[PDB]
Design a protein around this ligand. Structure first.
Ligand SMILES: Nc1ncnc2c1ncn2[C@@H]1O[C@H](COP(=O)(O)OP(=O)(O)OP(=O)(O)O)[C@@H](O)[C@H]1O
Ligand SMILES: Nc1ncnc2c1ncn2[C@@H]1O[C@H](COP(=O)(O)OP(=O)(O)OP(=O)(O)O)[C@@H](O)[C@H]1O
Ligand SMILES: Nc1ncnc2c1ncn2[C@@H]1O[C@H](COP(=O)(O)OP(=O)(O)OP(=O)(O)O)[C@@H](O)[C@H]1O
Ligand SMILES: Nc1ncnc2c1ncn2[C@@H]1O[C@H](COP(=O)(O)OP(=O)(O)O)[C@@H](O)[C@H]1O
Ligand SMILES: [Mg+2]
Ligand SMILES: [Mg+2]
Ligand SMILES: [Mg+2]
Ligand SMILES: [Mg+2]
Lengths: 244, 97, 111, 197, 385, 260, 253, 52
């Protein structure tokens, strides 16, 4: 009956290792490059789409960049379908924190909550986990700008500069040589574009296949302005940094 | 008339099946008028492999050797094949063409 | 797939407690213990560098013994070495890398 | 090193043979295509041109190619659905070339021995050179080539050996005075991963 | 200066003296050939002729005849003739047969073969103990078994149990078991035969087993002995083709060896060293656990062990004054002595490239990078993260 | 290979097993009293197939009964010998079988007839087929003069899935017995024989070593004793303790479990 | 293949010419060289290239070596290769075997081909001692480490593991550079066009442009290659690749 | 086909019948010059015996 068609999907291997999580990391390597760089005045999130076409409208698309709350946005690298569930869970959770403490959610809390769901699915129910890796750009008062990567097992790790998805190794090695702690958002915008030009997922990097967003404290009175740049505002910055 | 069953030509020795139909063919080219009866061709039928074992690849070679004799640089004259198959669904589009 | 070392004090007690729990559902108290990679190697070191009869007398010798055990396998400066000390009745202090560096250098020189 | 004649009863070198001798027969039928011409075609008029450009044209005019400056035309892979004559395409052209033509099969490269199979493919390659220019057509390479490398028993390893040797020998060394070998395939799923190219 | 002069004195008189004595004696022998000698040598030529075909003596039939097997496909029933008798012969010895009419006319080979030449060695091994340094505990299983009964078989008699018999070196590549076999045999003070089991594989029939048989005959003459059959894994169970075979002879060879383990008399005086990659690279058909005794399991060097191994290598390496041993050990995790050997050589290559005499610490890191390169594992933080 | 009533009893076989009492029933009972079989009208058994893992002691047991029953013991092992080569082994099988039958009161053992008097071996390690002549001779010989005058035929096979059905049919085999991996207390007993021969500690617990072991054959227990001897020599004692055997069991278990 | 040339000079030339220098500054001698990388990189062409300057007998040896059988079997001419090579000193053996034995006989050390190869390798050590040092290079060439034989398997087990990179844009442009002279030099220097538009995984793809370009020039009845002859030629070679790249670039998740 | 590994085309000898001479008739042939001298019964392998 019911037990006949089950194969015990989520279990350890003799190494201790969870089959579905190992498999999940392969499918995130299919999905495009997403890079996060934490400057000392913001966080730059820059992602190259895994789809491009001349018939594809990419001028209203925000398929990787999604705002969870006013101070925390994510870039997506993995299954867009799977990610959608976690994105609306995050919105509910951040609003719930705001409702109960009348204070904006710290970046640590929101990431931890999502991580618990991913662990839970391999723990019980036989459910597949979400095969996505997110880079969280977030501001909070206490720790300032915080950068985080989450993996499909359900664990989060802090960084200063990091890449997930396609070409994680190549992007990382370039970042190690170029990254400095004296970098500003201006410098980080230029670095992100250059790294994506050397880790390009075809033979060209273009504005229309670039999604780009920052969170900058350069808005007046110490306030933080999340700006998701349109592809023609990306184009302006593409000529500025001399990619084109 | 050569009544030959096609499950009858199969050997683990590679190219032995290809050898057998090639000689059968050379005999038929000499012995005109001749009809070659390939009966139950479904045994060495099927298509693909190359993730199979070399037994399959030989069956695919034999199936292909068939293919060589009929059309290619060899032709039929007053030679003639009748192929019999008991299931047409084992049988392959390359021979239903 | 997770095993823990749960340690601490009870309220109005200066008795140190060191327990190990494992994913089997069993737990055991220990005078000293080690889990994780190369637990056999560290444990073997502790047979000669720890006595059941006599624990490290001072806080500092206990701290340097734990630094000394880590400097076997872990190595690689005080970067990857962490030390948390709990002292009786809710006094938790964490000894930063700078503190650890001093302890490492003393052990290295002496050895 | 090449074949040579020895006396039967004197057991000595009295006479010499061409190296062409003691090597594979070249078309087991008569060499040329039966009454089937460009008239009968009925295709594929353009692509047949591309085949003429590749196979006959360098062989007839060498000087012309020397003018462009390019090395002479590389091997041809004929793939597509069947009933396209692709096999007939090579025979029709070769007819009209008026150069030697070589007809061995992939189902003739077979062996039930040890290394006897790779040795047969070897006699073709050298033989092509001796009776130069030459048009080499192999009818099948589908199950003589392997996408996934196997060696499950000894008998998987023998097929593999023929693949190895074909690639290495393919290749240019002294450089080819032939048109570079032509092969035909029902599909390329049963070819190698990247070693054709 | 004077240490030269004294050696000079002795070595000149002995060599020189001898040359003059040999030089005169070749003449003193040849001048008289009268009486016994001329007669003897003459008969021996007549019974013989030219050419003489190599043979092999399978058996003697007790009527002054023998069964012989030629290098030509036929085999033959021959008469025993000449100065060589059946008392002077023994089965399995190579013998001279006259071409035209097959009869044993003599011997000059006396069981000398191109396999016999490779096996022979009665000299001490090249490596002594801890050249081969370290895998001390591994030596402290091989020595127990191999050195100790040869030295005093007494020990086992007082203990009250059968002596040890053979050892199976098995487990990790790159631990030097092919070197280790040498190290021990020096220490004991014994004769050391060495043969590679790949040369006991033959495409000729009945030849496979003849080659296995020669080994134990030799071993018994020069006893105590330690015989190294290097790579019994290479007889293995393998197959050349299965459509023209090659997999018959493999079995017959494997079999001839299992029999002479015990069957060459119950002795730990006819020790064997069998090196094998794993046991499941052998024919699974096997002799019982005590007949081969202790199986010696090689495993990866630990942190302490590979300091030892590394240290050996780098002493040999010249112009490395900027390298400190410890720091090499810190960065690396557990690995064979094999890969230490490579890293040291790749580090000379880099420094030769650059055209700089010195070998840096920095240099060595580049060599670590190259060796470790394609061992990468990201499913380590797949489980951990 | 052939012997002649070798001195082994049930005392020297470690434990009494069910498979020993099934041997008693084939071998001793018709030899001692063929009378009772006759009056009953049950045929006396003379056929036994012995199969199990190796190192269980099957060989010790055949001899045990050989001594008890008082019958000369002829052991032939065909895959040990080199006599197999195209019917050359067919002669070994013909001759010895007929010779043993001449002898009164006798036991014939063709051992390891997995091949060499067993099934084909074409698909095997070898490409052999020499084995099928030797099988051909064996089949006939056990019908050439029956009733045999109380001469028992034993057969050793490791796996009884390597023996030909012609051989399996009745008269050739009249009892079938699987040898069992000896029990923990039964290993205390197999150990006891080896340990009494060895100079050891008096008051040793045999049962302590057997507790520590999991199911291990008697051949293993013989190797462990030699192994413990070695470690005893290394410390410069020639009198062993329970301690040398703790070591010895650890060596074997980790060593063998992984592979063969 | 800029890096690759510079590494392999040290590897091949220097042990031959000065076996003592190689030992003095560093340590040991190489016991082998193993070439691997994608097809079409021209590794076979490299081994020919370096051997010219080395001044030794580049024999090669094509394919499997079980192929000899007509004077007797090829199941010991692997082994005895050690001897044959020694005789013809100073000699370079390009024993090639591209490998298609897979992962199957890596386990164990199975295969009879692998035994004989193993036996030659056991031999192979002795060469540093049988007439002193090395003067004969054993250059093996295989496509990858996965499909490889068991005896050749582990890093540095036959010495020197050298991965050949797929060529960079700057490298593609240099590979293009040489074929241009051989052909008729372009009008308008449009050499950089080809290099920017695509980068291959092989020196073969570059070469593929040259030949493709001369189909179009030939037809137009103009000898000289031009930008237009180039634009058609890069479009033809890139067609093969764009089609398999639109199916993961579009209609994906 | 000889057991000397040769294929030989022989003029039929008048001694024997053409009706005995079948595919795999075992035949005596003269050692010197090769001519069908006589006929022999067929031998059967061990593979034949089990089955029958
Ligand atoms: N262009 C043509 N004009 C005339 N007849 C043609 C033409 N094309 C094909 N045919 C006919 O169809 C037959 C089949 O073509 P052919 O034998 O070349 O097949 P193929 O495509 O090579 O198949 P396979 O996949 O079996 O190799 C020809 O022998 C010929 O009779
Ligand atoms: N004990 C040692 N001290 C010094 N060098 C050592 C030692 N052990 C091994 N090495 C080094 O490592 C090399 C590799 O060892 P060796 O050739 O004996 O391998 P192996 O374990 O027999 O492998 P395979 O499975 O291929 O037979 C030695 O030639 C030597 O240079
Ligand atoms: N660097 C180059 N310059 C010029 N031509 C090149 C270059 N590299 C390769 N080629 C071209 O590509 C062809 C194929 O390369 P080759 O057969 O030598 O490759 P490989 O990397 O050794 O492959 P395999 O994996 O089949 O052993 C060459 O014959 C040549 O025409
Ligand atoms: N039950 C036992 N008691 C004692 N020794 C045993 C026992 N079983 C096996 N052995 C030991 O193992 C050895 C080899 O077993 P053996 O009699 O050849 O058997 P088998 O036919 O089952 O392989 C015996 O000689 C004996 O030393
Ligand atoms: Mg066709
Ligand atoms: Mg070795
Ligand atoms: Mg037995
Ligand atoms: Mg190549």
């Amino acid at each position: 009956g019911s037990r006949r068609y089950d194969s015990r999907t989520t279990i350890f291997s003799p190494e201790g290792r969870l089959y579905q999580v190992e498999y999940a990391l392969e499918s995130i390597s299919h999905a495009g490059t997403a890079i996060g760089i934490m400057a000392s005045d913001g966080i730059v999130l820059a992602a190259e789409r895994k789809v491009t076409s001349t018939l594809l409208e990419q001028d209203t698309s925000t398929e990787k960049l999604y705002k969870l709350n006013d101070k925390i946005a994510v870039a997506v690298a993995g299954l867009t379908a799977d990610a959608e569930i976690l994105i609306n869970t995050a919105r509910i959770h951040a609003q719930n924190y705001l409702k109960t403490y009348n204070e904006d959610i710290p970046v640590e809390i929101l990431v931890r909550r999502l991580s618990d769901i991913k662990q839970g699915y391999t723990q019980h129910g036989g459910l597949r986990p979400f095969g996505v890796s997110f880079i969280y750009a977030g501001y909070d008062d206490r720790y300032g700008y915080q950068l985080y990567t989450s993996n499909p097992s359900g664990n989060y790790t802090g960084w200063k500069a990091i890449s997930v998805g396609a070409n994680t190794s190549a992007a990382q090695t370039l970042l190690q040589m170029d990254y400095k702690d004296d970098m500003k958002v201006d410098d980080a915008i230029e670095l992100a574009l250059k790294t994506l030009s050397k880790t390009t997922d075809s033979s060209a990097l273009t504005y229309d296949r670039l999604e780009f967003a920052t969170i900058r404290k350069g808005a007046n009175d110490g306030e933080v302005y999340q700006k998701i740049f349109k592809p023609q505002e990306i184009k302006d910055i593409l000529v500025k940094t001399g990619i084109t | 008339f050569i009544f030959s069953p096609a499950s009858g030509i199969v050997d683990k020795y590679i190219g032995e099946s290809a050898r057998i139909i090639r000689e059968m063919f050379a005999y038929a080219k000499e012995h005109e008028p001749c009809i070659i009866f390939m009966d139950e061709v479904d045994a060495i039928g099927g298509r693909r492999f190359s993730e199979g074992t070399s037994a399959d690849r030989e069956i695919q070679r034999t199936l292909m050797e068939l293919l060589t004799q009929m059309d290619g640089f060899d032709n039929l004259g007053q030679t003639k094949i009748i192929m019999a198959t008991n299931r047409p669904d084992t049988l392959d589009p390359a021979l239903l063409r | 797939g997770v095993s823990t070392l749960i340690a601490g004090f009870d309220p109005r007690d200066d008795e140190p407690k060191l327990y190990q729990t494992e994913p089997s559902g069993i737990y055991s108290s220990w005078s000293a213990q080690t889990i994780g990679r190369n637990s056999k190697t560290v444990r073997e070191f502790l047979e000669k560098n720890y006595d059941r009869k006599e624990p490290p007398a001072t806080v500092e010798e206990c701290v340097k013994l734990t630094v000394r055990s880590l400097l076997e396998v872990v190595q690689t400066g005080a970067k990857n070495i962490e030390i948390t000390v709990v002292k009786p009745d809710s006094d938790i202090v964490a000894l930063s890398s700078e503190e650890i560096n001093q302890y490492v250098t003393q052990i290295e020189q002496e050895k | 090193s090449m074949s040579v004649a020895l006396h039967r009863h004197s057991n000595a070198l009295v006479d010499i043979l061409p190296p062409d001798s003691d090597s594979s027969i070249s078309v087991m039928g008569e060499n040329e295509k039966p009454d089937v011409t460009y008239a009968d075609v009925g295709g594929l008029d353009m692509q047949k041109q591309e085949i003429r450009e590749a196979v006959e044209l360098p062989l007839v005019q060498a000087d012309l190619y020397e003018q462009i400056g390019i090395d002479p035309p590389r091997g041809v892979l004929l793939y597509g659905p069947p009933g396209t004559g692709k096999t007939m395409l090579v025979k029709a052209v070769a007819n009209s070339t008026k150069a030697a033509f070589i007809r061995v099969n992939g189902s003739e490269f077979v062996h039930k021995y040890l290394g006897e199979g790779p040795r047969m493919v070897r006699d073709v390659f050298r033989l092509a050179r001796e009776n130069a220019p030459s048009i080499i057509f192999i009818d099948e390479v589908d199950s003589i080539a392997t996408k996934r490398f196997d060696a499950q028993t000894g008998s998987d390893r023998e097929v593999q050996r023929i693949l190895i040797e074909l690639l290495t020998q393919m290749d240019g060394f002294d450089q080819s005075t032939n048109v570079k070998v032509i092969m035909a395939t029902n599909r390329a799923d049963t070819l190698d991963p990247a070693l054709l190219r | 200066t004077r240490c030269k002069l004294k050696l000079l004195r002795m070595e000149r008189i002995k060599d020189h003296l001898l040359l003059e004595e040999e030089f005169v004696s070749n003449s003193e022998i040849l001048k008289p050939f009268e009486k016994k000698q001329e007669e003897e040598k003459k008969q021996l030529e007549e019974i013989r002729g030219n050419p003489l075909s190599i043979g092999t003596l399978e058996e003697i039939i007790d009527d002054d005849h023998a069964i012989v097997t030629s290098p030509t496909m036929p085999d033959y029933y021959v008469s025993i003739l000449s100065f060589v008798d059946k008392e002077l012969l023994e089965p399995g010895c190579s013998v001279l047969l006259h071409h035209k009419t097959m009869s044993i006319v003599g011997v000059l080979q006396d069981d000398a073969d191109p396999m016999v030449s490779v096996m022979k060695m009665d000299k001490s091994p090249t490596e002594s103990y801890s050249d081969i340094g370290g895998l001390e505990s591994q030596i402290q299983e091989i020595k127990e078994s191999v050195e100790l009964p040869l030295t005093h078989p007494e020990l086992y008699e007082e203990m009250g149990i059968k002596p040890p018999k053979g050892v199976i070196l098995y487990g990790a590549p790159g631990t030097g078991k092919t070197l280790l076999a040498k190290a021990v045999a020096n220490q004991t003070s014994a004769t050391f035969l060495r043969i590679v089991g790949s040369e006991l594989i033959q495409k000729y029939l009945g030849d496979g087993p003849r080659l296995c048989r020669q080994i134990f005959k030799v071993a018994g003459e020069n006893a105590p002995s330690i015989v190294f059959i290097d790579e019994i894994d290479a007889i293995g169970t393998k197959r050349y083709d299965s459509n023209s075979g090659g997999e018959r002879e493999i079995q017959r060879t494997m079999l001839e060896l299992l029999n002479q383990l015990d069957g060459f008399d119950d002795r730990g005086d006819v020790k064997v060293i069998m090196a094998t990659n794993k046991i499941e690279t052998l024919d699974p058909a096997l002799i019982r656990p005590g007949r081969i005794d202790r199986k010696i399991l090689f495993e990866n060097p630990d942190l302490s062990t590979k300091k030892k191994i590394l240290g050996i290598h780098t002493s040999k390496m010249n112009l490395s004054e900027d390298v400190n041993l410890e720091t090499l050990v810190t960065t690396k995790d557990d690995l064979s002595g094999a890969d230490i050997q490579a890293m040291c050589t790749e580090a000379g290559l880099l420094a030769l490239r650059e055209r700089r005499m010195q070998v840096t610490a920095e240099d060595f890191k580049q060599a670590k990078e190259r060796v470790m390169k394609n061992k990468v594992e990201e499913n380590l933080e797949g489980l951990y993260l | 290979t052939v012997e002649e009533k070798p001195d082994v009893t049930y005392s020297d076989v470690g434990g009494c097993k069910d498979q020993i009492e099934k041997l008693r029933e084939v071998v001793e009972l018709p030899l001692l009293s063929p009378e009772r079989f006759a009056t009953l009208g049950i045929d006396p058994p003379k056929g036994i197939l012995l199969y199990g893992p190796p190192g269980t002691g099957k060989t010790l047991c055949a001899r045990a009964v050989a001594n008890r029953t008082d019958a000369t013991f002829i052991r032939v092992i065909g895959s040990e010998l080199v006599q197999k080569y195209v019917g050359e082994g067919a002669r070994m099988v013909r001759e010895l079988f007929e010779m043993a039958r001449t002898k009164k009161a006798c036991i014939i053992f063709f051992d390891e007839i997995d091949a060499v008097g067993g099934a084909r071996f074409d698909d095997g390690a070898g490409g052999d087929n020499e084995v099928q002549r030797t099988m051909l001779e064996l089949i006939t010989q056990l019908d050439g003069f029956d009733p045999r005058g109380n001469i028992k035929v034993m057969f050793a096979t490791n796996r009884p899935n390597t023996l030909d059905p012609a051989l399996l049919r009745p008269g050739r085999i009249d009892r079938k017995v699987e040898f069992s991996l000896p029990d923990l207390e039964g290993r205390a007993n197999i150990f006891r024989i080896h340990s009494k021969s060895m100079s050891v500690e008096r008051g040793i617990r045999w049962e302590l070593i057997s507790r520590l072991c999991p199911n291990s054959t008697g051949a293993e227990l013989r190797s462990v004793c030699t192994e413990a001897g070695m470690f005893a020599i290394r410390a410069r004692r020639k009198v062993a303790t329970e301690k040398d055997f703790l070591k010895a069991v650890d060596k074997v278990i980790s060593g063998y479990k992984k592979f063969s | 293949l800029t890096k690759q040339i510079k590494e392999i000079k040290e590897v091949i030339e220097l042990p031959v010419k000065h076996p003592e220098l190689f030992e003095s500054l560093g340590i040991a001698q190489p016991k082998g060289v193993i070439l691997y990388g994608p097809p079409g990189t021209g590794k076979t062409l490299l081994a020919r290239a370096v051997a010219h300057h080395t001044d030794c007998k580049f024999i090669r040896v094509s394919g499997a070596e079980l192929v000899q059988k007509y004077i007797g079997e090829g199941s010991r001419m692997v082994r005895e290769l050690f001897v044959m090579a020694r005789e013809h000193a100073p000699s370079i053996i390009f024993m090639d075997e591209i490998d298609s034995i897979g992962s199957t006989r890596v386990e164990g050390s199975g295969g009879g081909d692998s035994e004989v190869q193993r036996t030659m390798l056991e031999l192979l050590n002795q060469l540093d001692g049988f007439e002193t040092s090395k003067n004969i290079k054993i250059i093996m060439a295989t496509n990858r480490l996965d499909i490889l034989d068991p005896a050749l398997l582990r890093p540095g087990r036959i010495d020197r593991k050298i991965e050949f990179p797929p060529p960079s844009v700057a490298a593609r442009a240099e590979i293009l550079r040489i074929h241009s002279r051989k052909m008729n030099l372009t009008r308008g220097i449009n050499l950089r066009k080809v290099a920017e538009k695509m980068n291959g995984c092989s020196g073969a793809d570059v070469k593929g442009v040259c030949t493709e370009a001369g189909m179009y020039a030939l037809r137009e009845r103009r000898i000289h290659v031009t930008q237009e002859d180039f634009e058609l030629a890069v479009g033809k070679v890139m067609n093969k690749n764009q089609e398999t790249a639109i199916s993961v670039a579009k209609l994906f998740k | 086909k000889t057991s000397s590994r040769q294929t030989v085309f022989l003029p039929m000898v008048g001694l024997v019948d053409p009706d005995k001479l079948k595919p795999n008739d075992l035949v005596g042939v003269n050692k010197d010059s090769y001519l069908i001298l006589d006929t022999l019964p067929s031998e059967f392998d061990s593979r034949v015996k089990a089955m029958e």
